[PDB]
Amino acid sequence: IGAIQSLKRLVSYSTNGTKSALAKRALRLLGEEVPRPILPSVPSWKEAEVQTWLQQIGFSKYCESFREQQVDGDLLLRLTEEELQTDLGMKSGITRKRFFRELTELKTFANYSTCDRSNLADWLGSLDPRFRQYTYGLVSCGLDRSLLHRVSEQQLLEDCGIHLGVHRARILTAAREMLHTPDVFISYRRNSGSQLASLLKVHLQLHGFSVFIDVEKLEAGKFEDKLIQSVMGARNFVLVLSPGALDKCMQDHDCKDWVHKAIVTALSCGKNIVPIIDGFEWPEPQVLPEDMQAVLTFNGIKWSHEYQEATIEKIIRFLQ
Amino acid sequence: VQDALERALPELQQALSALKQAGGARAVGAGLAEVFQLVEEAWLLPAVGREVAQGLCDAIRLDGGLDLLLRLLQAPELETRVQAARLLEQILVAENRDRVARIGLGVILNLAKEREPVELARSVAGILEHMFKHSEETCQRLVAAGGLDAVLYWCRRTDPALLRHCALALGNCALHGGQAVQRRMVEKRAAEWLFPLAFSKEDELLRLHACLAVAVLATNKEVEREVERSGTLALVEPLVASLDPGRFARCLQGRGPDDLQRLVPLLDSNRLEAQCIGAFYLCAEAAIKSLQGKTKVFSDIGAIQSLKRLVSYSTNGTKSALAKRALRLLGEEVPRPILPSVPSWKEAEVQTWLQQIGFSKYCESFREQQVDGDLLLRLTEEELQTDLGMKSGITRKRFFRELTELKTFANYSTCDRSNLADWLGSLDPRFRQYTYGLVSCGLDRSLLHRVSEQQLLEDCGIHLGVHRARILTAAREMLH
Amino acid sequence: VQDALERALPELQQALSALKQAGGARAVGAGLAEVFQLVEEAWLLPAVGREVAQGLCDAIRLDGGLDLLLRLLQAPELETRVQAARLLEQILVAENRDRVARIGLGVILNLAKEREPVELARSV
Ligand SMILES: NC(=O)c1ccc[n+]([C@@H]2O[C@H](COP(=O)([O-])OP(=O)(O)OC[C@H]3O[C@@H](n4cnc5c(N)ncnc54)[C@H](O)[C@@H]3O)[C@@H](O)[C@H]2O)c1
Ligand SMILES: NC(=O)c1ccc[n+]([C@@H]2O[C@H](COP(=O)([O-])OP(=O)(O)OC[C@H]3O[C@@H](n4cnc5c(N)ncnc54)[C@H](O)[C@@H]3O)[C@@H](O)[C@H]2O)c1
């Protein structure tokens, strides 16, 4: 009767685990082997995936034909009548038409994530689910959603390779009728201030606040060429106070520590300094140099690791 | 080999009978601890305990203990719940994952809502991590429900192992999810939560798996804009440049051929960070497979020709050094970087370009015809078919794909007067192949407004009419 | 052919061990002068010292002395800076240039800003 090849098509094109498990059990209780589920990224196929796709659907005669010609997944999506007839030894047009039916079934169930920029396969699928075979043919010509209104019928015939004129008319009709300086600077300590600074940057960029990070990237000998351009452009300032944050800022009477440079630059600018305390006691005013003693008079915010959302909202209520 | 199996089967029989028989409050957790300790003893055997641990997981599955663990995950007590979760974490093999996809989905998903204790979350993150590796249907059922939100909330923690489990969970979900799964991750900003996971200087594996997840999300062309707006691609290349693959190859015992096929389209997706991640991982795992004797897997899958394309078309020193080290640790030679001045090529550079990309059969064909770089840029269908003995159109089409890749990365300084290649590149980066075809006709920026379609077809040799229409439209609307 | 290699390897081993061990203000520059004088003796051999100088640059690279020179280029003293620069000038072979492109970019670029003394600039 021929239910075995239909079960092989169920296994090789499965989007459900139950029918695939039942088809694998049905092919296991019979006398033949079970096939494998194919990799959907067909433009990412090498030669072995093409050979496996040949072995699973019933083209075992033409396995040596594609291997000598070195046909990968990029050449399988772009194969025509003449290359099947002359170069591949597939002289019969009925065998070629069965191969194009299997190619239609393959190019329906395919992942085009490596080349589709504007999600053209879902545009083709919203009209008719058999239109998704020309996704590679329209993407490989350089098209997207913003360029289909200037495409003609000859460009779909010759370049995109759409042989049916009804599909060309429907694609043209549907293409014509419905288509047409950071703000928050964060200084942190190298030892235990990286994760809290990155977490503050993520929770501020969830609300659209542009945040500059990587002070340590500018610690490669660049003295003041980019720190001034970062802080002068920064609308606000966040001082991550790790446990032991201002230890290296004590007795630094030569302006060598980078966190001390950030504090002196922020006090020279006069920006809104918002300290973030993560288990850190307030240091003495007299042990710090006189160019940074004003940081102890700003309204700091204590950090809670299990109640972070209200703390981030309190930070957002204390910014511009 | 089979002695550890005969030592470990009846002990787990007695332990699973004790778990099935006793239903107390503290002896059940003690039995779970005994089974989990025997699992720890099973996985820690050098080159023995892999098949032993797979057989013991098969013995747990065939006894019915997986349904017992699914019952104990719904227990109201916390201690037996965390021991049942930590026992279920270490037994998720490819035969158990089918059973968990059949029944166990929805029970672990119920534990994904309880997020406050750390001892649940450290194991449930690993359970979801290994359950993202099953299929695309399980990825859709976890992302559409509250399975992705649990990982994206647990990325806020400071646990140096739970963040590893979350990084591997997002990486496996990006590898095995699909189009709609990547859309529901990135539209819910899953790439932004990897930023503390890509920067944390406490662990080195954690940043690597975070940048792996970032690169696999960045291999999708409909996604790359929000990933560049996330800012996590800037931390990939200094991380790969600052580390050495030999130490991370000695630290890790490799991955199978199914997972090796996931690292290959990282190199052919024309993004710098994804190519660096793929070259680093294939170099480390090529060192692993060169310690063993199974280096024929890369020739069966085909990553060697992609590494040769990385070396022969390198614009970065780090990915080129990693690809040269990966090809050196294998059994073949490394290629040389080509000279970009293709109109300045003589015959020997053309022969070298043939030898580096896989046209060793046609090396004697171009030498007798005296094809230099000027004739290589101006080669067509008929000269390949008749004069060069390349009768097959599929071989000609592979040669034109390699010619497209060559004429994309080419120096035209000897003939381009008005910088036409940057004019072609500003529209579409695949338009730079016709730079020689438009310059060789005598054109520049001040003459494209009087060019017709027939002049682009016959003289410039543009075979695609869509590209002809776009070039004519851009020549008419913005030049003059 | 290989006699100059066997004469020049343990002397550079002792000299790079003296550069790695001593961290003074004037003996380090004397060790840099000894290494640079042996480099001058290495490049001035008729049709012999090419592969010999390449092997000695490989021996300097595999010992870790290139990172030592990159550390001494960030020294606050001027004399050890100019001897480290003049030593780094004569050892830039195609295998060393990969290491300098990996790490050494940005340290030499920092010396590109200091332009007034001639003894730095002639070597940089
Ligand atoms: N030390 C540990 O605690 C430990 C170690 C490993 C696994 N586990 C547990 O095991 C479960 C996951 O294991 P898995 O089996 O599903 O892994 P997996 O299938 O997801 O990863 C592939 C593994 O299979 C191996 N492999 C498969 N085919 C191979 C081949 N042809 N040649 C060489 N190697 C091949 C690879 O080496 C690789 O380790 C999890 O529960 C995990 O916690 C624990
Ligand atoms: N007298 C000196 O002080 C002296 C002389 C030479 C080099 N150096 C130093 O060496 C470094 C640069 O040397 P380099 O090796 O990088 O030079 P290079 O590679 O930039 O220049 C090419 C050199 O390699 C030789 N060469 C390479 N392949 C050859 C081949 N197949 N056949 C014949 N000759 C071949 C050439 O003769 C030529 O001298 C610098 O630091 C420079 O100061 C110093």
PDB file of N, CA, C and O in Angstrom, chain B residues 213-241:
ATOM      1  N   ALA B 213      25.893  32.289  23.761  1.00  0.00           N
ATOM      2  CA  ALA B 213      24.462  32.547  23.601  1.00  0.00           C
ATOM      3  C   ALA B 213      24.209  33.844  22.836  1.00  0.00           C
ATOM      4  O   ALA B 213      23.309  33.904  21.986  1.00  0.00           O
ATOM      5  N   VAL B 214      25.024  34.874  23.098  1.00  0.00           N
ATOM      6  CA  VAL B 214      24.924  36.143  22.372  1.00  0.00           C
ATOM      7  C   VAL B 214      25.231  35.950  20.888  1.00  0.00           C
ATOM      8  O   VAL B 214      24.520  36.477  20.023  1.00  0.00           O
ATOM      9  N   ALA B 215      26.249  35.144  20.569  1.00  0.00           N
ATOM     10  CA  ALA B 215      26.616  34.920  19.172  1.00  0.00           C
ATOM     11  C   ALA B 215      25.563  34.100  18.431  1.00  0.00           C
ATOM     12  O   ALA B 215      25.254  34.390  17.266  1.00  0.00           O
ATOM     13  N   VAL B 216      24.993  33.084  19.088  1.00  0.00           N
ATOM     14  CA  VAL B 216      23.971  32.261  18.440  1.00  0.00           C
ATOM     15  C   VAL B 216      22.686  33.065  18.239  1.00  0.00           C
ATOM     16  O   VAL B 216      22.004  32.925  17.213  1.00  0.00           O
ATOM     17  N   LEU B 217      22.366  33.966  19.177  1.00  0.00           N
ATOM     18  CA  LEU B 217      21.270  34.900  18.925  1.00  0.00           C
ATOM     19  C   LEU B 217      21.624  35.914  17.840  1.00  0.00           C
ATOM     20  O   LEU B 217      20.730  36.403  17.140  1.00  0.00           O
ATOM     21  N   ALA B 218      22.910  36.225  17.671  1.00  0.00           N
ATOM     22  CA  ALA B 218      23.343  37.178  16.657  1.00  0.00           C
ATOM     23  C   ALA B 218      23.549  36.552  15.283  1.00  0.00           C
ATOM     24  O   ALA B 218      23.882  37.276  14.339  1.00  0.00           O
ATOM     25  N   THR B 219      23.386  35.236  15.142  1.00  0.00           N
ATOM     26  CA  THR B 219      23.422  34.633  13.811  1.00  0.00           C
ATOM     27  C   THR B 219      22.122  34.800  13.030  1.00  0.00           C
ATOM     28  O   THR B 219      22.077  34.417  11.855  1.00  0.00           O
ATOM     29  N   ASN B 220      21.075  35.355  13.634  1.00  0.00           N
ATOM     30  CA  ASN B 220      19.799  35.549  12.957  1.00  0.00           C
ATOM     31  C   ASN B 220      19.729  36.983  12.439  1.00  0.00           C
ATOM     32  O   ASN B 220      19.948  37.932  13.198  1.00  0.00           O
ATOM     33  N   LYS B 221      19.410  37.133  11.148  1.00  0.00           N
ATOM     34  CA  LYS B 221      19.519  38.433  10.488  1.00  0.00           C
ATOM     35  C   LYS B 221      18.412  39.394  10.908  1.00  0.00           C
ATOM     36  O   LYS B 221      18.586  40.614  10.811  1.00  0.00           O
ATOM     37  N   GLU B 222      17.276  38.873  11.369  1.00  0.00           N
ATOM     38  CA  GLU B 222      16.181  39.697  11.870  1.00  0.00           C
ATOM     39  C   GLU B 222      16.360  40.098  13.328  1.00  0.00           C
ATOM     40  O   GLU B 222      15.453  40.704  13.907  1.00  0.00           O
ATOM     41  N   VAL B 223      17.505  39.772  13.927  1.00  0.00           N
ATOM     42  CA  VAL B 223      17.729  39.918  15.361  1.00  0.00           C
ATOM     43  C   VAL B 223      18.908  40.846  15.667  1.00  0.00           C
ATOM     44  O   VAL B 223      18.879  41.537  16.703  1.00  0.00           O
ATOM     45  N   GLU B 224      19.856  40.995  14.726  1.00  0.00           N
ATOM     46  CA  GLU B 224      21.172  41.587  14.994  1.00  0.00           C
ATOM     47  C   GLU B 224      21.095  43.050  15.426  1.00  0.00           C
ATOM     48  O   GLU B 224      21.994  43.541  16.119  1.00  0.00           O
ATOM     49  N   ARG B 225      20.031  43.759  15.031  1.00  0.00           N
ATOM     50  CA  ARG B 225      19.907  45.171  15.386  1.00  0.00           C
ATOM     51  C   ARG B 225      19.671  45.356  16.881  1.00  0.00           C
ATOM     52  O   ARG B 225      20.328  46.186  17.520  1.00  0.00           O
ATOM     53  N   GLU B 226      18.765  44.567  17.465  1.00  0.00           N
ATOM     54  CA  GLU B 226      18.516  44.670  18.899  1.00  0.00           C
ATOM     55  C   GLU B 226      19.670  44.094  19.714  1.00  0.00           C
ATOM     56  O   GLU B 226      19.870  44.493  20.867  1.00  0.00           O
ATOM     57  N   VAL B 227      20.451  43.182  19.130  1.00  0.00           N
ATOM     58  CA  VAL B 227      21.634  42.669  19.815  1.00  0.00           C
ATOM     59  C   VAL B 227      22.741  43.720  19.829  1.00  0.00           C
ATOM     60  O   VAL B 227      23.444  43.879  20.836  1.00  0.00           O
ATOM     61  N   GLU B 228      22.901  44.467  18.731  1.00  0.00           N
ATOM     62  CA  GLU B 228      23.858  45.572  18.717  1.00  0.00           C
ATOM     63  C   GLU B 228      23.398  46.710  19.622  1.00  0.00           C
ATOM     64  O   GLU B 228      24.223  47.417  20.214  1.00  0.00           O
ATOM     65  N   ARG B 229      22.083  46.906  19.741  1.00  0.00           N
ATOM     66  CA  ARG B 229      21.569  47.884  20.695  1.00  0.00           C
ATOM     67  C   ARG B 229      21.672  47.394  22.135  1.00  0.00           C
ATOM     68  O   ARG B 229      21.636  48.214  23.059  1.00  0.00           O
ATOM     69  N   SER B 230      21.790  46.079  22.346  1.00  0.00           N
ATOM     70  CA  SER B 230      21.970  45.557  23.698  1.00  0.00           C
ATOM     71  C   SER B 230      23.361  45.877  24.235  1.00  0.00           C
ATOM     72  O   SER B 230      23.523  46.164  25.426  1.00  0.00           O
ATOM     73  N   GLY B 231      24.375  45.831  23.372  1.00  0.00           N
ATOM     74  CA  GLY B 231      25.731  46.143  23.767  1.00  0.00           C
ATOM     75  C   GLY B 231      26.558  44.968  24.239  1.00  0.00           C
ATOM     76  O   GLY B 231      27.675  45.176  24.730  1.00  0.00           O
ATOM     77  N   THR B 232      26.052  43.742  24.110  1.00  0.00           N
ATOM     78  CA  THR B 232      26.780  42.562  24.558  1.00  0.00           C
ATOM     79  C   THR B 232      27.761  42.031  23.520  1.00  0.00           C
ATOM     80  O   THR B 232      28.567  41.151  23.846  1.00  0.00           O
ATOM     81  N   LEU B 233      27.714  42.536  22.285  1.00  0.00           N
ATOM     82  CA  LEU B 233      28.682  42.128  21.273  1.00  0.00           C
ATOM     83  C   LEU B 233      30.038  42.792  21.461  1.00  0.00           C
ATOM     84  O   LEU B 233      31.031  42.310  20.906  1.00  0.00           O
ATOM     85  N   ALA B 234      30.104  43.887  22.222  1.00  0.00           N
ATOM     86  CA  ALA B 234      31.373  44.571  22.436  1.00  0.00           C
ATOM     87  C   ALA B 234      32.279  43.828  23.408  1.00  0.00           C
ATOM     88  O   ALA B 234      33.496  44.044  23.388  1.00  0.00           O
ATOM     89  N   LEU B 235      31.721  42.962  24.253  1.00  0.00           N
ATOM     90  CA  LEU B 235      32.509  42.209  25.219  1.00  0.00           C
ATOM     91  C   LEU B 235      32.933  40.838  24.711  1.00  0.00           C
ATOM     92  O   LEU B 235      33.565  40.088  25.462  1.00  0.00           O
ATOM     93  N   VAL B 236      32.600  40.490  23.470  1.00  0.00           N
ATOM     94  CA  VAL B 236      32.908  39.157  22.964  1.00  0.00           C
ATOM     95  C   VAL B 236      34.363  39.067  22.519  1.00  0.00           C
ATOM     96  O   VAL B 236      35.115  38.203  22.984  1.00  0.00           O
ATOM     97  N   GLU B 237      34.778  39.959  21.619  1.00  0.00           N
ATOM     98  CA  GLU B 237      36.106  39.933  21.003  1.00  0.00           C
ATOM     99  C   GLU B 237      37.275  40.175  21.972  1.00  0.00           C
ATOM    100  O   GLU B 237      38.291  39.480  21.835  1.00  0.00           O
ATOM    101  N   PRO B 238      37.218  41.108  22.952  1.00  0.00           N
ATOM    102  CA  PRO B 238      38.318  41.135  23.940  1.00  0.00           C
ATOM    103  C   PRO B 238      38.360  39.915  24.846  1.00  0.00           C
ATOM    104  O   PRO B 238      39.442  39.541  25.315  1.00  0.00           O
ATOM    105  N   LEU B 239      37.210  39.282  25.098  1.00  0.00           N
ATOM    106  CA  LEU B 239      37.189  38.053  25.887  1.00  0.00           C
ATOM    107  C   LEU B 239      37.869  36.910  25.146  1.00  0.00           C
ATOM    108  O   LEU B 239      38.661  36.160  25.728  1.00  0.00           O
ATOM    109  N   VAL B 240      37.560  36.758  23.856  1.00  0.00           N
ATOM    110  CA  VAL B 240      38.175  35.711  23.048  1.00  0.00           C
ATOM    111  C   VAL B 240      39.656  36.005  22.820  1.00  0.00           C
ATOM    112  O   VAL B 240      40.490  35.089  22.832  1.00  0.00           O
ATOM    113  N   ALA B 241      40.016  37.284  22.669  1.00  0.00           N
ATOM    114  CA  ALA B 241      41.417  37.640  22.463  1.00  0.00           C
ATOM    115  C   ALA B 241      42.231  37.496  23.745  1.00  0.00           C
ATOM    116  O   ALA B 241      43.443  37.258  23.691  1.00  0.00           O
TER     117      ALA B 241
END
